[PDB]
Design a protein around this motif. Sequence first.
Motif, PDB file in Angstrom:
ATOM      1  N   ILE B  58       1.280   7.448   8.009  1.00  0.00           N
ATOM      2  CA  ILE B  58       0.117   6.801   7.432  1.00  0.00           C
ATOM      3  C   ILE B  58      -0.706   6.323   8.608  1.00  0.00           C
ATOM      4  CG2 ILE B  58      -0.730   4.875   6.004  1.00  0.00           C
ATOM      5  CD1 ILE B  58       2.654   5.468   5.228  1.00  0.00           C
ATOM      6  N   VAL B  59      -1.890   6.902   8.763  1.00  0.00           N
ATOM      7  CA  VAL B  59      -2.756   6.603   9.906  1.00  0.00           C
ATOM      8  C   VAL B  59      -3.939   5.775   9.407  1.00  0.00           C
ATOM      9  CG1 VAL B  59      -3.720   7.535  12.005  1.00  0.00           C
ATOM     10  CG2 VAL B  59      -2.115   8.938  10.685  1.00  0.00           C
ATOM     11  N   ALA B  60      -3.876   4.456   9.602  1.00  0.00           N
ATOM     12  CA  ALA B  60      -4.804   3.522   8.962  1.00  0.00           C
ATOM     13  C   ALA B  60      -5.881   2.993   9.895  1.00  0.00           C
ATOM     14  CB  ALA B  60      -4.023   2.333   8.367  1.00  0.00           C
ATOM     15  N   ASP B  61      -7.101   2.859   9.375  1.00  0.00           N
ATOM     16  CA  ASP B  61      -8.116   2.034  10.029  1.00  0.00           C
ATOM     17  C   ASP B  61      -7.776   0.561   9.820  1.00  0.00           C
ATOM     18  OD1 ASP B  61      -9.669   4.135  11.054  1.00  0.00           O
ATOM     19  OD2 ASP B  61     -10.892   4.268   9.244  1.00  0.00           O
ATOM     20  N   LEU B  62      -7.762  -0.201  10.907  1.00  0.00           N
ATOM     21  CA  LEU B  62      -7.580  -1.650  10.819  1.00  0.00           C
ATOM     22  C   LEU B  62      -8.583  -2.283   9.866  1.00  0.00           C
ATOM     23  CD1 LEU B  62      -6.942  -2.694  14.502  1.00  0.00           C
ATOM     24  CD2 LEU B  62      -5.286  -2.341  12.679  1.00  0.00           C
ATOM     25  N   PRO B  63      -8.216  -3.423   9.261  1.00  0.00           N
ATOM     26  CA  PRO B  63      -9.189  -4.179   8.472  1.00  0.00           C
ATOM     27  C   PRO B  63     -10.502  -4.326   9.253  1.00  0.00           C
ATOM     28  CG  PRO B  63      -7.014  -5.184   8.234  1.00  0.00           C
ATOM     29  CD  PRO B  63      -6.862  -4.000   9.204  1.00  0.00           C
ATOM     30  N   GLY B  64     -11.629  -3.955   8.650  1.00  0.00           N
ATOM     31  CA  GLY B  64     -12.921  -4.095   9.314  1.00  0.00           C
ATOM     32  C   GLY B  64     -13.311  -3.006  10.292  1.00  0.00           C
ATOM     33  N   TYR B  65     -12.386  -2.104  10.601  1.00  0.00           N
ATOM     34  CA  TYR B  65     -12.623  -0.990  11.529  1.00  0.00           C
ATOM     35  C   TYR B  65     -12.780   0.347  10.815  1.00  0.00           C
ATOM     36  CZ  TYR B  65     -11.370  -3.649  15.826  1.00  0.00           C
ATOM     37  OH  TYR B  65     -11.349  -4.476  16.944  1.00  0.00           O
ATOM     38  N   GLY B  66     -13.542   1.245  11.426  1.00  0.00           N
ATOM     39  CA  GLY B  66     -13.629   2.619  10.954  1.00  0.00           C
ATOM     40  C   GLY B  66     -14.242   2.729   9.574  1.00  0.00           C
ATOM     41  N   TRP B  67     -13.453   3.199   8.618  1.00  0.00           N
ATOM     42  CA  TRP B  67     -13.941   3.312   7.258  1.00  0.00           C
ATOM     43  C   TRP B  67     -13.304   2.271   6.359  1.00  0.00           C
ATOM     44  CZ3 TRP B  67     -12.979   9.326   7.180  1.00  0.00           C
ATOM     45  CH2 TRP B  67     -13.927   9.937   8.005  1.00  0.00           C
ATOM     46  N   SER B  68     -12.432   1.427   6.903  1.00  0.00           N
ATOM     47  CA  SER B  68     -11.882   0.327   6.100  1.00  0.00           C
ATOM     48  C   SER B  68     -12.971  -0.673   5.781  1.00  0.00           C
ATOM     49  CB  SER B  68     -10.735  -0.386   6.821  1.00  0.00           C
ATOM     50  OG  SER B  68      -9.587   0.436   6.876  1.00  0.00           O
ATOM     51  N   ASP B  69     -12.825  -1.374   4.664  1.00  0.00           N
ATOM     52  CA  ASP B  69     -13.835  -2.365   4.309  1.00  0.00           C
ATOM     53  C   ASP B  69     -13.833  -3.511   5.318  1.00  0.00           C
ATOM     54  OD1 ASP B  69     -14.801  -1.021   2.050  1.00  0.00           O
ATOM     55  OD2 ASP B  69     -13.432  -2.061   0.702  1.00  0.00           O
ATOM     56  N   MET B  70     -14.926  -4.262   5.343  1.00  0.00           N
ATOM     57  CA  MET B  70     -15.073  -5.398   6.245  1.00  0.00           C
ATOM     58  C   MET B  70     -15.057  -6.711   5.478  1.00  0.00           C
ATOM     59  SD  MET B  70     -18.115  -3.863   8.720  1.00  0.00           S
ATOM     60  CE  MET B  70     -18.901  -2.961   7.385  1.00  0.00           C
TER      61      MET B  70
END
Lengths: 295, 295
Positions: B58-70
């Motif tokens: 599972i390759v996740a964008d950190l909270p607030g980073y990339g396409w994750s919500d802010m």
Amino acid sequence: DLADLFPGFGSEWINTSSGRIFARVGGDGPPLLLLHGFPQTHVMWHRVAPKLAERFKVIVADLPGYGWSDMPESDEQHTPYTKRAMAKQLIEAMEQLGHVHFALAGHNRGARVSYRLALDSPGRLSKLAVLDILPTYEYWQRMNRAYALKIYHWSFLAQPAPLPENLLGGDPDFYVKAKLASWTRAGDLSAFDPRAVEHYRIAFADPMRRHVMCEDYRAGAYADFEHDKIDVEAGNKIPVPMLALWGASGIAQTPLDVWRKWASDVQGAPIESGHFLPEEAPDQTAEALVRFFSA
Amino acid sequence: LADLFPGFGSEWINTSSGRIFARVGGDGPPLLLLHGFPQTHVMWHRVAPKLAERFKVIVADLPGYGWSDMPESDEQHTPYTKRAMAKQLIEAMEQLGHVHFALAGHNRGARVSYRLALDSPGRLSKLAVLDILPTYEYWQRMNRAYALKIYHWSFLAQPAPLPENLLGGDPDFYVKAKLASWTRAGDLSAFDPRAVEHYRIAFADPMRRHVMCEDYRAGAYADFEHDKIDVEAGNKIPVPMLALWGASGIAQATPLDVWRKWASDVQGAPIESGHFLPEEAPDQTAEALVRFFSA
Ligand SMILES: [Cl-]
Ligand SMILES: [Cl-]
């Protein structure tokens, strides 16, 4: 057009082997050189210089590379903007006026030029005043998390070119006004004459002038620190009678205890002020300087 | 643009603080990969395939980073504290039914990861951290030399809007300079240009840059305090742990000696690489991780 904030003062463009030094010159009596720092120019003294000119021949100079002084090309060791080189250059400038022994007051970078001048060439100075600074060695030696966060720009502006230059280039007015305000007692621009702020803003608007400022702070992180380290590890103290004046809300803050390590004949006092003593507290600063240099 | 994860799906995972974006691939025991600054999940593209040979990755964008919500921040930078980020990623993993998983992080993501292990060790079977020391340890080491080398820890932590204003002038320059400066080569040649474009695109958004600054503000304040409590309590991570670091990276001042003070079961090894292990040295990083995570 920029205002004349020293009504009645002459203007000189003084040649040196390292480039011209611009100065305003006024008064009569014993010679007194005044040196500004960052992010300012010689005009920062405009509220105290008229009063000093009642007692002294006052030379208000732009540092090498600042204001209207020439900007020597720098090098890998940031040599022309080290305080050692700046002090040599200003010694040459004062010789051009016939001054080989003079009184000296500096603020911020100019105070660093001034104590380095006293360490390298004490014979040149009758008396020395340094306004709201500790030695560069002491700033770095106390470095820790709290200081890194409180006073970040030393490490930021010392990053290799062109990183600080490119960051400052987007919106330079914002950065210089933010720095001026942030270091005052109240945290706004109310201490400054708006005409003086415009002088600082116009200097800061030139990318060449900003590069010089970054070179100055690079020197501050490297050669200046090394020069200082040599003196403190050798136990060399300034023998010139000295005054350390600082702001109760300034950057340097006891500073007198620090300076007693560096100088064998030093006196000192705080003034209720942020960093910019000659503008935030002009009457008190002018009085302290007149009394020190007259004694 | 550009899909750098052959055979991986794309998922938006709901949490109480907003969506986490992740690329998901493979089968077998679950393994979460967490990037840092100034990157996104795509930094794992050269090692995730090898890992997905043996794991569900599972390759996740950190909270607030990339396409994750802010999530909206506050005066204490709460949602971008590593404690909060870890709680949010624990919720995301629960959405997938993963309540006990393996975890590898780099840079900010490795800080989320060791904070997760300190707060909720039951969530982790094994932990790998790439080229970091604990936030407490970097701040304890913040002398002149370190203030100069990792200046951005203090610069990006300055009160808003100072770094946001400066970063907006030429964001492409800054992100590319950071990427290059921390590699062995000192240029962008270790990176896939398609990956660099992912990083540039994210960094181009002022909202994303603000999140990054909130992350470093947390790193200077709450994250530091959280770490300080564990140090004072003598708490160690009990999770089996791997510390990898670049021979010319930031963590190296001996990394395994440091982590042994923070963790009761840790092995480690240097990799011939700058900071960006999974891109500069993908074969050796992947091999080290596979061997460690395999039972
Ligand atoms: Cl100081
Ligand atoms: Cl980091």
